Ligand binder design. Structure first.
Ligand SMILES: Nc1ncnc2c1ncn2[C@@H]1O[C@H](COP(=O)(O)OP(=O)(O)O)[C@@H](O)[C@H]1O
Ligand code: BEF
Ligand SMILES: [Mg+2]
Lengths: 93, 78, 91, 641, 93, 23, 73, 102, 14
């Protein structure tokens, strides 16, 4: 089975494994690294999306929108302080 | 038609709205000219680098991607 | 083109399938994904160079993420990475 | 509340002594009364009286104290006075009653009020006023109101026709519904062919020449199908703004008994129209026909799209160029039993526009596609364009005055090749050369064609040019005559046309000026005024009433304003200027048909005499290339015929 | 929706529909039972049964249209057997 | 590449409907 | 909040100073609006903090100068 | 080929072979099959055009019997030509007598 | 189904 499905991961391990070469980050890359990277990428996006889903749901909207993302991002201090210099286009204060 | 927009385009009511969004209660009538200056400086800083990005592409047109590059690094520092 | 929106849709359906997403929000997610990726990768590279290493491994990224990431998110993500690579390698 | 006074009659003297013909915020114009400052006292809106006091002061200053004001400027002030006061008197005459209600008064009595709309005026003013005055001032309007209350020409009286379409064939009789004049064979054959096309079931195009009767023809046909085809359900006529009054006037003369309306104005106006004029017992809609402009469709797209329309009619239908136009979208979100597209020339530019038109008539029914397209000469495209021609011909009506009525005298048309001034040569070179210093001396190169074209008409389109010119003259600034010279010298076309204008002034000839550029039409307005000329301007900026009355006055035979100055985009369309013998164009557009339309503004059923047409062409400049491309576009027209 | 609306709905449904309106196994059973009366032991192409089914339905619906026209001519809405008999006789059957 | 050249009426097909006032 | 036409005319003016001939994607103008609004609002929140620290309801230009120095410089 | 010489699509050779095989006449002039093939494929082109329009109005990529029935009943000439003809998976033209409706 | 590991403050965004 594919490397992602072997890991159970929902991201293109092959792309990122390629990208690790394509970005010159190192002339060698070890097989777990793109897998480990994909795992944390999935985890990170899940955490934000969960909060943003609550934000849309709380606003009675099915559509997740920048407002709902921004509201989520600023409500978690960790995400907010992690993302303190990220600016959300059409994300209101 | 004598006035020039670059200063005037940013105007008392819009500044008032920005301040209200910024939670300001009341403002001195002097403030607007400071902010226009600051805005010019801020704008001036970013667009110069966008120009140089556009130069390195040798293109006449400036894209949002060039803006994103200039705005990315400059915004994080500022 | 080289974009994650399909993977965003996967995890979106996996996390809140009752929610749609604006293309704007989807693009923001793509920008977000790229930002965090280049942040962790650029760090791990410079750490590897500091360690005089021509290769990047799980340890480098596992260290880099613990450097970048807030303390809870770090150990949670670290555990997720170690679990995932354990499943991958045990397979 | 206070409303702003009709007139004034007898600074502290101005405040104490004088008297003003007030109006009030809740009372119709006929409730005007003469009132005084202390008699009214402090009342809501008194700043309007302050404004009028300031106006009256400056009126006194201009009329009486300023020694420079010339007698003709006093006559123009008297014109402004009497014309506005007469238009206030027209606001003092009703135009329409909308409904009737009886209401209780504070005395415990009751009175019957008619919801009255007023002339030159709309449903923002219109209000319930006691019939006691309506019945004596406009019993004709009372009769018409009682008709419009009761026509039974309404959506509920007609079915879903599409399942069946009976035949029709051409006829030779004057339409009996019509009061407004006398169709000839060509207008009647318009009616006939539209009826036949309807009887195939179809949607059609009318492209007998510009000014040849379409409006009267289309109202006669809509009357025929209402009466003959029982088309009692709503019809929507979409119209360019400037012509909306004339269309109304057509009804008001040709079938004045019909219950039809024009839809315009602020949200309040449109709301009061919808609820009072459209709705019965809010729904079913009181009117048979609604006039609208294009944008007022977008203003109520879904709302008006909720009506089951029986007929769409479209003036200047080339306004619908392509499927992606917001108008084209909205009109195809609407559903209708019939469509009819009116324009004295069926395509401006290109086969794709005609394809979009025929798709709007009969979507997908015509195999017109890029795969065969207008190579300038090609046996295959020339075959297929004749095949499309014969395919469409049952679905188009087209004629010239040359066919229709040889009585209508022809047009002289000529190009006037003219040389650049030195100023022109300098600036044009300074566009051919890239001189940022010259730009800094009076600032963008980002459209060189536009910069050089507008320069080529006039260097004063760069504001520093007037300074540097009149200063290098030195005397130019100093006097009106020196300004006039320093201006008119600066373009060879301006010199030539000034000579021609002086000739026409001695001739007494009546003339239309057209241009693409509003700033040039401003410079020319100033030239006319400093030359002491009597004229009107029209462009897309002047609102409905002033533009209308300007057209009316200029068409009035006593109009001493012998020149009309017009934009092309607004003024070149739809309108008849029968008082003008001559037309001049400062600059052709990319599109020739717009120029033909401008010509049509003179060239009309109503033109008494042979017209003369002149195009001001600068020597050795791009407009010659524009003209050749426009001629190629006309070659496409000649190919489709 | 006001009673009788069900009739209009059924009408518009079945005119929209093209599909067979009658149970197929009963039909095939009946036809082979009749055929046995003409001759024993016939086997059938299934497609033959389908063709016969289509013809039978088409003929019946034609007859029903004819009888509806008769019924409206009698200025009543209920179809009556005498209407069938008339329609058949006018068709000469 | 092939086309009718008979004269014909305009005709349209619609399967579908709504029970607008049956409530 | 801020008006695209004036804003973009200002932007083109400043660009014209550096290059003297430009073209712009409308997305670039949008991005500049978003950036400028966010930056200004943040600076307003700072200067308000300064004003209330000085126990004024009105913000003062001194508060702008101070905030810009402390955060920006 | 003969069909190509005529520019027809239909198989002139096949139809000539059938005209012999069908024993319609002891003699078959060479023009007969050309003329027949022409008018035949013209007829099919007509009804195909109508069925295509029906498929367009139903908004379907594939022509199906319903569309044929709709087209052929809607064209009075064809329905007259086909007054005793019927098709599988056809159906009545959707229609209700006005007196039945409220 | 993509469960979240962190235990975090509940939020109302409405
Ligand atoms: N049947 C007619 N009899 C007399 N005059 C007519 C007739 N039809 C049109 N006209 C004249 O034509 C003018 C209207 O031009 P019109 O034909 O309505 O423009 P278009 O039809 O091109 O939109 C009117 O002023 C009217 O005097
Ligand atoms: F529309 Be017509 F040509 F005035
Ligand atoms: Mg017209």
């Amino acid at each position: 089975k594919t490397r992602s499905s072997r890991a159970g991961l929902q991201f293109p391990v092959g792309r990122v494994h390629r990208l690790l070469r394509k970005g010159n980050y190192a002339e060698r890359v070890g097989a777990g690294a793109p897998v480990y990277l994909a795992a944390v990428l999935e985890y990170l996006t899940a955490e934000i999306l969960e909060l943003a889903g609550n934000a849309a749901r709380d606003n009675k909207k099915t559509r997740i929108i920048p407002r709902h993302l921004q509201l989520a991002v600023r409500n978690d201090e960790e995400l907010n302080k992690l993302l303190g210099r990220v600016t959300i286009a059409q994300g209101g204060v | 038609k004598v006035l020039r927009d670059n200063i005037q385009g940013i105007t008392k009511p819009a500044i008032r709205r920005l301040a209200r969004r910024g939670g300001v209660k009341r403002i001195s009538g002097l403030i607007y000219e400071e902010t226009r200056g600051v805005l010019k400086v801020f704008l001036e800083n970013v667009i110069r680098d966008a120009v140089t990005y556009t130069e390195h592409a040798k293109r006449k047109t400036v894209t949002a991607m060039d803006v994103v590059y200039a705005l990315k690094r400059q915004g994080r520092t500022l | 083109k080289e974009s994650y929106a399909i993977y965003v849709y996967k995890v979106l359906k996996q996390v809140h399938p009752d929610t749609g997403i604006s293309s704007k929000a989807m693009s923001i997610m793509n920008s977000f994904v790229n930002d965090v990726f280049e942040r962790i990768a650029g760090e791990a590279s410079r750490l590897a160079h500091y360690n005089k290493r021509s290769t990047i491994t799980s340890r480098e990224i596992q260290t880099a993420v613990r450097l970048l990431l807030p303390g809870e998110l770090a150990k949670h993500a670290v555990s997720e990475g170690t679990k995932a690579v354990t499943k991958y390698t045990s397979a | 509340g206070i409303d702003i006074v009709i007139n004034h009659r007898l600074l502290n003297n101005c405040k104490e002594n004088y008297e003003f013909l007030i109006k009030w915020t809740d009372e119709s114009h006929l409730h005007n009364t003469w009132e005084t400052y202390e008699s009214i006292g402090q009342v809501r809106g008194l700043k309007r009286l302050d404004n009028y006091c300031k106006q009256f002061i400056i009126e006194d200053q201009q009329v009486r104290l300023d020694p420079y004001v010339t007698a003709e400027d006093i006559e123009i002030m008297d014109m402004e006075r009497e014309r506005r006061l007469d238009e206030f008197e027209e606001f003092h005459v009703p135009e329409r009653i909308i409904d009737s209600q009886r209401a209780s008064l504070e005395d415990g009595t009751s009175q019957l009020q008619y919801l009255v709309k007023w002339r030159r005026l709309n449903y923002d003013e219109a209000t319930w006023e006691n019939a006691t005055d309506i019945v004596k001032l406009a019993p004709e309007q009372v009769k018409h109101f009682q008709n419009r209350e009761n026509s039974k020409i309404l959506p509920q009286y007609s079915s879903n026709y599409t399942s069946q379409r009976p035949r029709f064939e051409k006829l030779s009789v004057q339409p009996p519904f019509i009061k407004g004049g006398e169709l000839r064979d060509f207008q009647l054959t318009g009616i006939n062919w539209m009826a036949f096309l309807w009887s195939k079931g179809d949607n059609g195009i009318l492209a007998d020449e510009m000014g040849l009767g379409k409006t009267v023809q289309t109202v006669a046909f809509i009357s025929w199908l209402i009466f003959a085809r029982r088309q009692n359900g709503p019809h929507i006529i979409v119209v360019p703004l400037s012509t909306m009054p004339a269309w109304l006037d057509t009804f008001e003369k040709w079938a004045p008994d019909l219950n039809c309306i024009c839809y315009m104005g602020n949200q309040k106006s449109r709301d009061t129209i919808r609820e009072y004029e459209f709705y019965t017992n809010p729904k079913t809609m009181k009117f048979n026909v609604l006039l609208t402009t294009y944008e007022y469709i977008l203003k109520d797209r879904a709302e008006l799209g909720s009506i089951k329309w029986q007929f769409m009619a479209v003036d200047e239908a080339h306004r619908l160029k392509n499927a992606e136009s917001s108008l084209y979208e909205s009109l195809n979100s609407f559903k209708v039993a019939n469509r009819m597209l009116i324009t004295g020339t069926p395509l401006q530019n290109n086969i794709k526009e005609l394809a979009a038109l025929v798709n709007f008539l009969m979507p997908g029914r015509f195999t017109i596609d890029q795969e065969i397209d207008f190579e300038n000469q090609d046996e295959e495209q020339e075959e297929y364009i004749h095949d499309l021609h014969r395919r469409i011909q049952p679905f188009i009506l087209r004629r010239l005055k040359k066919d229709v009525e040889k009585s209508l005298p022809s047009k002289t048309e000529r190009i006037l090749r003219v040389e650049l001034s030195d100023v022109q040569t300098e600036y044009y070179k300074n566009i051919l050369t890239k001189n940022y210093s010259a730009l800094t001396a009076g600032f963008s190169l980002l459209n060189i064609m536009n910069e050089l074209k507008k320069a080529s008409n006039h260097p004063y389109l760069f504001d520093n040019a007037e300074e540097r010119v009149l200063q290098k003259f030195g005397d130019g600034k100093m006097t009106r005559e020196n300004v006039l010279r320093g201006l008119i010298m600066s373009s060879g076309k301006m010199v030539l046309l000034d000579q021609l204008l002086t000739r026409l002034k001695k001739d007494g000839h009546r003339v239309l000026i057209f241009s693409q550029m509003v700033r040039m039409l401003d410079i020319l307005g100033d030239y006319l005024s400093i030359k002491g000329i009597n004229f009107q301007r029209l462009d897309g900026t002047v609102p409905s009433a002033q533009r209308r009355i300007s057209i009316d006055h200029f068409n009035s035979p006593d109009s001493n304003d012998f020149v009309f100055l017009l934009s092309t985009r607004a003024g070149g369309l739809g309108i008849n200027l029968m008082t003008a013998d001559t037309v001049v164009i400062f600059d052709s557009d990319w599109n020739p048909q717009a120029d033909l339309q401008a010509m049509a503004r003179a060239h009309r059923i109503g033109q008494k005499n042979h017209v003369m047409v002149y195009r001001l062409v600068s020597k050795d400049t791009v407009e010659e290339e524009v003209l050749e491309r426009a001629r190629k576009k006309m070659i496409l027209e000649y190919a489709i015929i | 929706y006001r009673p009788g609306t069900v009739a209009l709905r059924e009408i518009r449904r079945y005119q929209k529909s093209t599909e067979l309106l009658i149970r197929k196994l009963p039909f095939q059973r009946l036809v082979r039972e009749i055929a046995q009366d003409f001759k024993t032991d016939l086997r059938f192409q299934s497609s033959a049964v389908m063709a016969l089914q289509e013809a039978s339905e088409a003929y019946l619906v034609a007859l029903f249209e004819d009888t509806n026209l008769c019924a409206i001519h009698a200025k009543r809405v209920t179809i009556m057997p005498k209407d069938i008999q008339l329609a058949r006789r006018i068709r000469g059957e | 590449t092939r086309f009718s050249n008979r004269q014909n009426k305009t005709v349209n097909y619609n399967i579908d409907y709504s029970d607008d006032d049956l409530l």
